[PDB]
Amino acid sequence: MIGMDRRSGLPLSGLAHLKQSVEDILTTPLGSRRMRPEYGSKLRRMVDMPVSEGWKSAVQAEVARSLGRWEPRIGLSAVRVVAVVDGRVDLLLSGVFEG
Amino acid sequence: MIPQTLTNTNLFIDGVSFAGDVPSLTLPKLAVKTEQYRAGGMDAPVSIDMGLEAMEAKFSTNGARREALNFFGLADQSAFNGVFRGSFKGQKGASVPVVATLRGLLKEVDPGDWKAGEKAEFKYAVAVSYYKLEVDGREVYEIDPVNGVRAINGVDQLAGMRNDL
Amino acid sequence: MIPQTLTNTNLFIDGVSFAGDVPSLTLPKLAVKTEQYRAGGMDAPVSIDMGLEAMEAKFSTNGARREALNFFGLADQSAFNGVFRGSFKGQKGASVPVVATLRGLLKEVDPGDWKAGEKAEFKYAVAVSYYKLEVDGREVYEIDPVNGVRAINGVDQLAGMRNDL
Amino acid sequence: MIPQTLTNTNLFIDGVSFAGDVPSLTLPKLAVKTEQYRAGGMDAPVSIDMGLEAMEAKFSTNGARREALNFFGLADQSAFNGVFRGSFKGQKGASVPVVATLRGLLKEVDPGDWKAGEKAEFKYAVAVSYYKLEVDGREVYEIDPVNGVRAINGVDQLAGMRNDL
Amino acid sequence: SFFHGVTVTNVDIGARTIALPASSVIGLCDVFTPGAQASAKPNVPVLLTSKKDAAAAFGIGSSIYLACEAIYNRAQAVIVAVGVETAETPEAQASAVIGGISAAGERTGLQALLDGKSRFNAQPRLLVAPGHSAQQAVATAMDGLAEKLRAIAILDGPNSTDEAAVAYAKNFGSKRLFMVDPGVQVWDSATNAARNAPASAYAAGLFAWTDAEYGFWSSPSNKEIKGVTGTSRPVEFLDGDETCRANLLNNANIATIIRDDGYRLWGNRTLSSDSKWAFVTRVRTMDLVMDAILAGHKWAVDRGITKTYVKDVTEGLRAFMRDLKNQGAVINFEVYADPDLNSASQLAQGKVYWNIRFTDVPPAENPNFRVEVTDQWLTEVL
Amino acid sequence: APGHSAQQAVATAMDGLAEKLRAIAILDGPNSTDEAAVAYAKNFGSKRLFMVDPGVQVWDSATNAARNAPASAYAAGLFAWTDAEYGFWSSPSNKEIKGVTGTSRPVEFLDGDETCRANLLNNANIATIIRDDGYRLWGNRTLSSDSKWAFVTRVRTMDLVMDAILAGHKWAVDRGITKTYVKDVTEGLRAFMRDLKNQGAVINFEVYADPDLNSASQLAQGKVYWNIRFTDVPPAENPNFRVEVTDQWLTEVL
Amino acid sequence: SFFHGVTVTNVDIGARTIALPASSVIGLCDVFTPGAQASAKPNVPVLLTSKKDAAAAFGIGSSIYLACEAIYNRAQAVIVAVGVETAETPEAQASAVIGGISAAGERTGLQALLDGKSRFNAQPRLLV
Amino acid sequence: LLVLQPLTANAQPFYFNLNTAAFDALQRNSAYNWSGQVRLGRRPALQSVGMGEESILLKGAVFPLRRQVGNQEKVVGLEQLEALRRLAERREPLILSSGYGEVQMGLWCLVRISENQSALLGNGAPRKQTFDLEFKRYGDD
Amino acid sequence: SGYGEVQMGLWCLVRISENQSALLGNGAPRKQTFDLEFKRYGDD
């Protein structure tokens, strides 16, 4: 499938379109889209919550829901905390490719 | 804490005293009914406070006491009462009266082996339907099976379970 | 290694010391729950680390201690704490403080046979919900049943099972 | 044959020696799993070589040995190794070194009754995942559960079962 | 200036220098351009794990990255990459790759791969000079550096015809050399045509894919090459000992890419004069158990010789080599202390000997199939 | 004295203060190459000096850069570490170093009797640092021209079994010599040496009074003599593994 | 010089069948070639322990080792083995393998097997 | 431990952990629809005529007097299995979200809830609730 | 198989049913007792 890039307007198809397809899921909140209320992630609700070991398993369980809806060509493997600086947690979104 | 221990004991059945009769006692084994809770994620199974076991108070008698044999198998429960008493002396002579007022049903009578030269024993057993232990003068246990009052140290623990829900 | 062994012991319940009371202890039997794995090709069944058994810590008391009998059957678990201590002397006098901080629920009280001349014993039992053994000053065991931290020699072994998967 | 018997013993855990600690051993009970085969025509049921039972090696320790308590319940099997040694003297002084190199998983730790005057004992148990007995210098047993090599007197008996079929 | 929302990050974050598989670390030496886009000094080693590390330390058009991409397309490997400044004379270009102690106290060229350990915990096991191994002076440099390093050097022949590469293999026989002569070609995005890669780095990425996914004891010949198209020479192959250009190279101890023009490597024998050390799996399992013996038994250089110490490691090795035996890395072995050469005259000197005897698994390069039929015991028809 | 031991005049005062104190004096080298570090160790050879030439560079949190520590305090904190549980009899020549990064110069041990940078510096009786980012120490041998006192362990054991005896024998000096005075302390020297055999400090010893030097004329001036001849554990600096690939157990694969 | 650390060598050794019952000793005598690799004088006895010093005292292709490999194939005993220089005529070879007191104060040939004890503490009970 | 979450995507999900339900058993039946057709003189022919019902059954027990972890002044509730019931009368499939192998399990409709609540208090409050949930895989496109 | 006849026929797989228990924190079991169930595909 051939789509266009979000910035700079260039049509990119293979796997750069795959990565921006995921980051339109993860950063859109629910109900922000027009006439598509069941689109996006609850990750903005997980913004600025304390990083516990139940916060990690609630992000894995919510990325898997939101990518399971509107990204069928990605099989999610794991989400892991790899570093912590002040506020900035960072997550290695790893997943196999299907489709 | 000074070392204390049992030195002498006593037993009452419906007021009268067995002041020269009983060689043995057994207060009822207070044991909580535990259910092994291991689940997803947790490693070792925990045990949960989920009620008490069957209380049963053995006592023993060397002679044919009509006052003890009167209360076997009566049609009314808690007709037997019984009061078990102990005295714990301490190291400095400060004797501590351990009194346990139970009100159960008398459950079992077995006059055992009546050998000729050997003394005989009448083992008794009491299906305890009420239990109340007092260490010095203060009430430690007060176990109502049929009522919802399990008082540990004078405060009801079953009442606190209803306020939590 | 110099020969060492137990010489004396001690016991704490919620801060107060049973410094003249307890004749006996039992730290909880740490036992792994083993499932016999024999399969196609393999000869003898191996046993697999698949969780711990039910920890239970007996201790015993000769006198009516109100501090020990207070904590039976409370509506909150881990209201009983308890601290069991030992002292292992060695051959050259280097005594080694073995302290075991548990935080379980008190499970069973049975004042046994109250014979007249014979001393009485109050056996106790503790449904252990937390266990922590320290040999000298260093933390050997730290068993969280309800949490996912089974620390052997200070490193969590349950955390290493999650990194392997 | 001259009369020989055990006089002294020793124990190694991961290299270090328990040269003053262990009062007791138990090498694992080697037992074949027998199925009773009686059939049409035959009178008494025969027992058939159909695999070994669960090997388990008890050993015991009187003091708090951090080297022994380190290996309980580790996330990797065969992290515990252990080496059990004996010395059988004979009638003419010809001592025979019986060494048994096992490589199991440590299964059970129970510090028993910590009475005050009585010495304490830490019973251990090892879920044996490898066993290798040597009588003098020659290898008698070599039991691989997880591999297909049951070597009796240095020759694999499980390999001979595959050549027969 | 922080940020308070959900964000995507496309740059590297975590460290992966913790694992470090000791059997698959690769020494790499070729030219590059040390500009401002290449953040690495020329004659120093630098640790690499991914293509982003090769992009940051070297140029994209530089032939270091063309060899780093050749390895990282196949395996998740670790590369100790040294660079050389490109010269004018090709006989002086080979003088830059061999290096030496031409500086004050710094090793340059291939000799800086000896400084892999004490910099990044990588004692290199695979030596490649992509393109700079058709010259004999560097193939002799990679020869003599190999037994210092206990590695094998994956050199390559010239991209001419077969007897130009068979006669180039006759200058060796030194047990440490694995030559793959057809320089395989790869598709390019910018050129939109067929390239010319020297195909010595592709065998290094295949060895790092073999020893981590199949074990180092497994023969790394019959396995897939990625990032590949046809070869520079169509090399035919049949079954039945013909005049094929596959059997001609393999009998000359030369490996070659064979089937479907780029699909698989083919051949496992090394440039060795001894038939005992003919296979690479005889050579790889010689050095990768005896440095895996040491890894874990690093306590054998201290804890001085007491009565139990000679006895401590003589089943310290027996318990470790039975772990090698059970995972298939060897077949049955024996480990025992040396009875006669161990003496108290040199035990005070520090020397104490152990005898290791193991046989390893043979690679089934030629399975024969004697087919026979019967009904119960004999051929009933004839 | 980190950094100052690279000077010749300081290291000689570091030398002569060690024989007055029965101590191991850890020296340094320059930041320069291996040839200028071997030449710094040739003029020594006085049985008490321990040279570590590679400049240990270490990260700091103040300026966020890499310093250059002169390698003395890391070996000093390692000699004091191996006496805590491995004992003074053990060798600290393959032990780990915490709080460390790489060296100023690379130095590695390889095999085959080539020009190894470690073997060139061990043969000059100088310790190095081998594995990644300051991971090990590598020297067993002191700067000693005498072949008997080569290893660090024999120099430390002879200096640290005596203060383990001279403490515990604060008595047996200015006491007063009775008839069984010599016997009651030579049975006390044995009892304070059998525990050293018990903890693995020595191999089998002998302690006995000197029969011919002890005399009646020596008692009048307070001089009494003993013989505490013992032996020590040699550190296994060279474990040799004789290894081949046979084809013996090839009939196992059938 | 010396070496620090583990130095992994590469040698050629056989099976570890060197377990030695000191029960029977063998007196042996055959011809050989006293080369540089054969570290044994001709008419003196050499105590042998295994094949590793039977290959060190006498050569591989020597007729001692062909008659000494056959013993260690079955029993790993200890051998009091004397050598003899080979001869041209078979009568002088038969006279040399016997030997005698023809030296200054030594015994040559088979007679050097009488010096088993007080040299080796092994009086040969098997004469071949 | 496991996460139930519906198709409306704004409703509150159910989280399985030691505070809420904490199952320790997991049956996963998965048939495969091979239909047999009996032929007269030979073996019956088998044809793959579909996929069949794949089901997941969650055992376990809720003890609604054990306090929440770390003693949060709050117990495991009696409400905390009826939340499984309210989430099941939505007539709606659910995404299972584990955390060990595959994380994106499919759409799983909830079919059966059956608790066995005993050891009662005075007002009928149990202190054990042994349940068994039972799912079937909703076959989406 | 590898013991009697080696060429067993065509066997279609019909049922998989695991019982995964003794769970970890993230739902990971440490036992998976299964029972597979085949039926012989009747080829020509």
Structure tokens at E134: 């058709």
Q: Which burial class, exposed, middle or buried, applies to D95 when counting CB atoms under 10 A from its CB (0-12, 13-18, 19+)? A: middle
Considering only CA atoms, give the Rg of chain D.
Answer: 19
- The experimental technique behind this entry is cryo-EM
CA distance B143 to B156: 10
Is C77 part of the contact surface with chain H (CB cutoff 8 Å)? yes
| Inter-residue long-range contacts of G102-111, CB under 8 Å, 24+ positions, other chains counted | G103/G43, G106/G43, G106/G44, G107/G43, G108/G43, G108/G84, G109/G29, G109/G43, G109/G82, G109/G84, G110/G27, G110/G29, G110/G82
Using CA atoms in the order H70, H72, H74, H77, what is the torsion angle rounded to 10 degrees?
-40
**How far does CA G83 lie from the centroid of its chain?**
7
Cβ–Cβ pairs < 8 A, chains A and H = 46
- Judge whether C3 and F198 are in contact, CB under 8 Å: no
Q: Residue with structure tokens 């006439």?
A: A35
Whether residue F230 contacts residue F157, with contact meaning beta carbons closer than 8 Å, is answered with: no
Contact of F129 with chain E, judged by CB distance below 8 Å, is answered with: yes
Q: Would you call H3 and A58 a contact, using CB atoms and an 8 Å cutoff?
A: yes
Q: Which residues of F are less than 8 Å from E351 in CB distance? A: 238, 240
Question: Rounded to whole angstroms, how far apart are CA atoms G10 and F244?
Answer: 6
Beta strands at E152-154 and E126-128: parallel, antiparallel or unpaired = parallel
Query: Which phi and psi angles does F79 have, rounded to 5°?
Result: -70, -35
Separation between Cα atoms, residue H81 and residue E334, nearest integer Å: 62
- How would you list the strands of the sheet with B56-61, edge to edge? B24-25, B56-61, B122-127, B105-111
Q: Pick from F108, F107, F114, F136: which is nearest to F29 by CA?
A: F107
**Per-residue exposure over F127-159, b if at least 16 CB sit within 10 Å of its own CB, e if not:** bbbbbbbbbbbbbbbbbbeeeebbbbbbbbbeb
Which residues, listed in sequence order, are joined to residue E127 by a DSSP beta bridge?
A: E27, E153
Distance from CA of H47 to the nearest CA of C (A): 31
Nearest-Å Rg of the Cα atoms of chain C is 19
Q: Which of E3, E8, E14 lies closest to A92 in CB terms?
A: E14
DSSP H87-118: TTTT---EEEE-SSS-SEEEEEEEEE---EEE
E335-342 contacts, C-beta under 8 A, 24 or more apart: E336/G16, E337/E310, E337/E311, E338/F242, E339/G18, E340/G49, E340/G52, E342/E310
Please tell me the distance from the alpha carbon of residue F60 to that of residue F76, in angstroms, as a whole number: 20
Residues of chain A found within 8 Å of residue E1, distances taken between Cβ atoms: none
The closest alpha carbon to D73, from D42, D105, D48, D102, belongs to: D105
Locate the domains of chain C by residue range. Answer: 1-165
Are the C-beta atoms of H62 and H17 separated by less than 8 Å? no
Report the C-alpha gap between D77 and C157 in whole angstroms.
Answer: 12
Do C105 and B49 meet the contact criterion of CB atoms below 8 Å apart? yes
Q: C124 to each of C23, C78, C105, C149, D107, how far by Cα in Å?
A: 12, 16, 11, 27, 26
Beta bridge partners of H43: none
* Cα angle value D120/D124/D125 (rounded, 5°): 155
Measure the CA–CA gap between A57 and A48, rounded to whole angstroms.
16
Element (H, E) at H86: helix H82-86
Please give the Cα distance from F155 to F148 (Å, whole number). 9
Contact between E297 and E314 under an 8 Å Cβ cutoff? The reply is no
Q: Reading across the β-sheet that carries B150-152, which strands appear in turn?
A: B16-17, B6-13, B83-88, B96-101, B131-134, B139-143, B150-152, B155-156
- Nearest partner of C95 among D64, I42, F89, judged by Cα: D64
CB nearest H3 (choices: A30, A31, A61)? A61
CB neighbour class for B144 (10 Å; exposed up to 12, middle 13-18, buried from 19): middle
Is F105 strand, coil or helix?
coil
- Run of H or E including D155: strand D155-156
The token duo for I36 is 């597979």
Task: Please count the other Cβ atoms lying within 10 Å of the Cβ belonging to residue C29.
Answer: 19
> Which residues in chain G belong to E strands, given as ranges?
7-8, 25-32, 45-48, 78-85, 126-127
In order, the DSSP letters of A14-58 are: SSHHHHHHHHHHHHSPTT-SSS-TT-S-STTTSTT----HHHHHH
CA E148/CA F116 separation, integer angstroms: 9
Q: Which of residues 21-60 of A touch E (CB under 8 A)?
A: 23, 26-27, 41, 43-44, 47-48
Cβ within 8 Å of residue H61, ≥6 positions away: B35, B37, B39, H128, H129, H130, H131
At residue H15, what are phi and psi to the nearest 5 degrees? Answer: -110, 120
d(CA F183, CA F169): 14
Residue position matching structure tokens 């419906």: B14
Would you call H10 and A31 a contact, using CB atoms and an 8 Å cutoff? Answer: yes
Beta bridge partners of H34: H48
Q: Using an 8 Å Cβ cutoff, are F55 and F71 in contact? A: yes
Contact call for residues G81 and G48 (beta carbons, < 8 A): yes
Cβ contact A26:A33 at 8 Å? no
- For chain I, what is the total number of helices (H) and then of strands (E)? 0, 3
Residue with tokens 């001690």: C10
Count CB neighbours of A82 within 10 A: 11
- Find the closest chain D residue to C86 by CA distance: D114
Give the G window 15-54 contacts with F, CB below 8 Å.
Answer: 15
Taking CA–CA distances from H25, the nearest residue in chain I reads I21
Residue F68 in contact with residue F57, Cβ under 8 Å? yes
Give chain C as a 3 state SS string: CCCCCEEEEEEEECCEECCCCCCEEECCCEEECCCEECCCCCCCCEECCCCECCCEEEEEECCCCHHHHCCECCCCCCCCCCEEEEEECCCCCCCEEEEEECCCEEEEEEECECCCCCCCCEEEEEECCCEEEECCCCEEEEECCCCCCEEECCEEHHHHHHHCC
- Give, to the nearest 10 degrees, the angle between helix E63-72 and helix E201-210: 30
Minimum CA–CA partner of E351 in chain G: G3
Cα G104 to the center of its chain, rounded Å: 23
Give SS3 for D59: strand
Query: What is the rounded distance in angstroms from the CA atom of residue D106 to the CA atom of residue C122?
Result: 34
d(CA H73, CA H68): 8
- How far, in Å, CA of E193 to CA of F51, rounded? 61
Find the residue in F nearest to E104 (Cα). F33
F238–G contact, CB cutoff 8 A: yes
The b/e string for E263-284 (b: 16+ C-beta within 10 A; e otherwise) is: eebbbbbbbbeeeebbbbbbbb
Of the candidates D143, D118, D145, D113, the residue with the CA atom closest to the CA atom of residue D131? D143
The single residue listed with the structure tokens 């012989």 is I40
Q: Which of B151, B102, B146, B150 is nearest to B127 (CA)?
A: B102
Q: Do H18 and B40 touch (CB under 8 A)?
A: yes
3-state helix, strand, coil in chain F (%, to 5): 30, 15, 55
Handedness of CA E164, E170, E173, E174 (dihedral sign): negative
Query: C109 and B29 in contact by Cβ < 8 A?
Result: yes
Per domain, the residue ranges of chain E are 13-273, 274-362
The label of the residue with tokens 């043969």 reads F123
Nearest Cα to Cα of residue G82 among G23, G5, G1, G28: G28
Please give the backbone phi and psi of residue E177, each rounded to the nearest 5 degrees, phi first.
-120, 135
Q: What is the chain B residue with the closest CA to I25?
A: B41
Enter the DSSP assignment of F17: H
Contact A94, A61 (CB under 8 A): no
3-state class (DSSP) for residue F9: helix
C48–I28 C-beta distance less than 8 A? no
Distance CA E252, CA E244 (A): 13
Q: Using H for helix, E for strand and C for coil, what is the string for chain E?
A: CCCCCCCCCCCCCCCCCCCCCCCCEEEEEEEECCCCCCCCCCCCEEEECCHHHHHHHCCCCCHHHHHHHHHHCCCCCEEEEEEEECCCCHHHHHHHHHCECCCCCCCEHHHHHHHCCCCCCCCCCEEECCCCCCCHHHHHHHHHHHHHHCCEEECCCCCCCHHHHHHHHCCCEECCECCECCCECCECCCCCCECCCCCCHHHHHHHHHHHHHHHCCCCCCCCECCCCCCECCCCCCCCCCCCCCCHHHHHCCCEEECCCCCCEEECCECCECCCCCCEHHHHHHHHCCCCCCCCCCHHHHCCCCCHHHHHHHHCHHHHHHHHHHHCCCEEEEEEEECCCCCCHHHHCCCEEEEEEEEEECCCCCCCCCCCCCCCCCCCCCC
- CB of A29 less than 8 A from some CB of H: no
CA–CA distance, E76 with E226 (Å, rounded to integer): 13
Q: Locate tokens 């001592």: which residue?
A: D95
CA E257 from chain centre, in angstroms, equals: 17
Listed by number, the residues of chain E in 320-379 with a beta carbon closer than 8 Å to a beta carbon of chain G are 334, 336, 339-340, 349-350, 355, 357
